[PDB]
């Protein structure tokens, strides 16, 4: 019947570019729909030469076992018969795409990069230049059971990095290896025991596993989204993939302890389709490192609005966070304390057009504490941030010795509220979630508390990490309609 990997795929001018090995274009699963470009750039150089790309072309546009059944594909050869390539050879393939984008008429371009090497400055820069031209790049996280931030093109902020899950929605394990993880991963997708086109015969099928199969699955979903809505931007498409994903189905015990909070618990899906609603996502900064003046900075992607800023430290030695304007957008800046291991800056990135979010700061009062509110017309409070200079201590409230920061976004169509939940003797964490139909915009811990490690948003739940009642404070927004 229908293979397991297609269970979450609801069937209702888009070109999918493939940069892989050679492909067998004559395969019944993909023939007439997959074009072979004259591009070829492989290092150190028959049915085994075609095995990888043929499977992936079948995963994307396969007639029987494809995600986007009948999608138009154009393949480039950047990987040899042993599936090996070069960053240099990959750049030339990407330049070939940019040249092809200008010759051929306008339309959505999906570039599938089911390969990985170490972090490359030039390769990530090439992925940035294409994304600035309106290209949707879907990449594999890597099969090294490592942090995908150490791999290119997985580490490129402008691409969609895809991790691999098995039939039980668990991260793929292959010997001492398996799927990569971390904050550079956007979501996961079926990447183990994936049936697809075999290059052995024109109607043969083979089962393959890897982040390549998972990335090809996401490229399939993206092509179906762009067929229905060809004017979707990359920011809109990334938010929809996250919104459409299955939540909390992955047991995070598979990931190293320090990567569980960073790794998104999302498995790709395409649910049955359906006005304007609020979509938010969480971005994690790089670790600040040990320095009393060290700083972690989390920013949002182009076309996104930063609505809140929070911070986190595994030791708890921190000096909070603050929102500040850089360019025309707000940035999330976290502060480390003296003798602190370092902090993470956590941002809430939403699609709220022409919101023009501004930061409103009140200095420490040293009175009974500090307070600030959004007073502008058509403005809503989306986040509450607080930082302090001391080594030991619609309104935002903070500690009397700390500055308080309010994110005020111009959005007449939104209605926001605050949900709280306090626990006197907490068992490592305090949780509060927004109701159904509500989007979490801000997660913060209530001040005057004993010892809080930090606060971060997990979908529509405010999570406050603990060592008076420790209170988790959630700012929930939604459209009036």
């Amino acid at each position, epitope marked *: 019947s229908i*293979p397991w990997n297609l269970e979450r795929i609801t069937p209702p001018l888009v070109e999918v570019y493939l940069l892989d090995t050679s492909i067998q274009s004559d395969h019944r*699963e993909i023939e007439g729909r997959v074009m072979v470009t004259d591009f070829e750039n492989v290092p150190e150089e028959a049915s085994k030469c075609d095995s990888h790309g043929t499977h992936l072309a079948g995963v994307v546009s396969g*007639r*029987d*076992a494809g995600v986007a059944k009948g999608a138009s594909m154009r393949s480039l050869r950047v990987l040899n018969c042993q599936g090996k390539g070069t960053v240099s050879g990959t750049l030339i393939g990407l330049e070939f795409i940019r040249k092809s984008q200008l010759v051929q008429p306008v339309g959505p371009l999906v570039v599938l990069l089911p390969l990985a090497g170490g972090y490359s400055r030039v390769l990530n820069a090439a992925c940035q230049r294409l994304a600035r031209a309106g290209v949707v790049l879907v990449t594999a996280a890597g099969n090294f059971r490592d942090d995908a931030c150490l791999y290119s093109p997985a580490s490129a902020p402008e691409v969609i990095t895809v991790g691999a899950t098995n039939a039980q929605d668990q991260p793929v394990t292959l010997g001492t290896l398996g799927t990569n993880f971390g904050r550079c991963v956007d979501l996961f997708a079926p990447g183990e025991d994936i049936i697809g086109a075999s290059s*052995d015969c024109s109607t*043969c099928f083979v089962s393959q596993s890897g982040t390549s199969q998972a990335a090809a699955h996401v490229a399939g979903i993206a092509a179906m989204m762009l067929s229905a809505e060809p004017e979707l931007t990359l920011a809109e498409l990334r938010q929809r993939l996250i919104h459409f994903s299955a939540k909390d189905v992955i047991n995070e015990a598979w990931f190293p302890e320090d990567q569980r909070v960073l790794t998104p618990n999302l498995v790709a899906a395409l649910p049955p389709s359906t006005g304007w609603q609020l979509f938010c996502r969480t971005v994690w900064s790089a670790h600040s490192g040990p320095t009393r003046m060290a700083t972690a900075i989390a920013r949002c992607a182009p076309d996104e609005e930063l609505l809140s800023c929070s911070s986190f430290s595994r030791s708890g030695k921190r000096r909070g966070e603050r929102m500040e304007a850089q360019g025309g957008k707000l940035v999330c800046r976290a502060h480390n304390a003296f003798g602190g291991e370092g902090v993470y800056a956590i941002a809430r990135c939403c699609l709220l057009p022409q919101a023009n979010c501004s930061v409103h700061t009140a200095p420490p009062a040293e009175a009974s504490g500090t307070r600030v509110h959004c007073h502008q017309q058509g403005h809503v409070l989306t986040g509450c941030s607080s930082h302090w200079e001391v080594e030991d201590l619609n309104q935002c409230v903070g500690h009397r010795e700390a500055s308080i920061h309010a994110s005020c976004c111009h959005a007449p169509g939104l209605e926001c509220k605050v949900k709280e939940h306090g626990i006197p003797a907490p068992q490592e964490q305090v949780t509060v979630a927004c109701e159904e139909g509500w989007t979490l915009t801000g997660c913060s811990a209530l001040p005057g508390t004993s010892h809080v490690l930090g606060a971060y948003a997990v979908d529509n739940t405010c999570v406050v990490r603990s060592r008076e009642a420790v209170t988790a404070v959630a700012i929930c927004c939604r459209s009036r309609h």
Partner: antibody
Framework: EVQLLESGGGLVQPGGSLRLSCKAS????????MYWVRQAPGKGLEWIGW????????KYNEKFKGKATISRDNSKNTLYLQMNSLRAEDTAVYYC???????????WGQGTLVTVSS | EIVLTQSPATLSLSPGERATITCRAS??????LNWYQQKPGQAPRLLIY???NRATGIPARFSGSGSGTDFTLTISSLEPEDFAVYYC??????????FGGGTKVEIKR
């Protein structure tokens, strides 16, 4: 019209060899795959081998590995089969079938009976 | 290698009555399965190709269905000339072809 004319049926001595032909007409002979499939009476379809009239590329069933040989003559649009060291179990009706690459067997021969007896 | 398992070995039915033959593939073959009809003293004839498409010049009473591993061949109303031997066929890597064991459709009285 497409015709596949077989020839070379009859009696073969045990230890002897069968030599069959399949004359093709009505199409571009080199653009289609060709198989030799046999069938013992009452039993099912047993493939013997394959040939690509264009390249000359062959494939054989492992049971007939050393014993079977398939050749062709594109100028005559003719397919050939040779099966050495025959035994009484090799008594079957032999067919030549056209392969429409990746789809099906669209044309068959009439069926040629080969009987192994001394 | 792929193994095509046909069920039943022999089907005994009456003319006009409906006939269903099953072919089970040991692996995923998609929808690239073929059906053949073999009358005695004759070569097999292409009946259904790509698991659901009727071959040229074959009546509409023959219908095929299935995708993946389970495949079925349906004869709505049994004509007396429909009583023959049926084979399911698929392509593979090595060996390049796989035929089913066959199903003999027999007249019941």
């Amino acid at each position: 019209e497409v015709q596949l004319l077989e020839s070379g049926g009859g009696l073969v001595q045990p230890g002897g060899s069968l030599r069959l032909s399949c004359k093709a007409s009505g199409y571009t002979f080199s653009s289609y795959g060709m198989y030799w499939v046999r069938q013992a009476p009452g039993k099912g379809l047993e493939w013997i081998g394959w040939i690509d009239p264009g390249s000359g590329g062959t494939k054989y069933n492992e049971k007939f590995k050393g014993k079977a040989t398939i050749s062709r003559d594109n100028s005559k649009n003719t397919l050939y089969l040779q099966m050495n060291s025959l035994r009484a179990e090799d008594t079957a009706v032999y067919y030549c079938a056209r392969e429409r690459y990746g789809y099906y067997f669209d044309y068959w021969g009439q069926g040629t009976l080969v009987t192994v007896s001394s | 290698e792929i193994v095509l398992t046909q069920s039943p070995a022999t089907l005994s039915l009456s003319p006009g009555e409906r006939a269903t033959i099953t072919c089970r593939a040991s692996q995923y073959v998609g929808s690239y399965l073929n059906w053949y009809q073999q009358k005695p003293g004759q070569a097999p004839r292409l009946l259904i190709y790509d698991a659901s498409n009727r071959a040229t010049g074959i009546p509409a009473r023959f219908s095929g269905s299935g995708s993946g591993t389970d495949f079925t061949l349906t004869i709505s109303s049994l004509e007396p000339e429909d009583f023959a031997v049926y084979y399911c066929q698929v392509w593979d890597s090595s060996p390049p072809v796989v035929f089913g064991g066959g199903t003999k459709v027999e007249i019941k009285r």
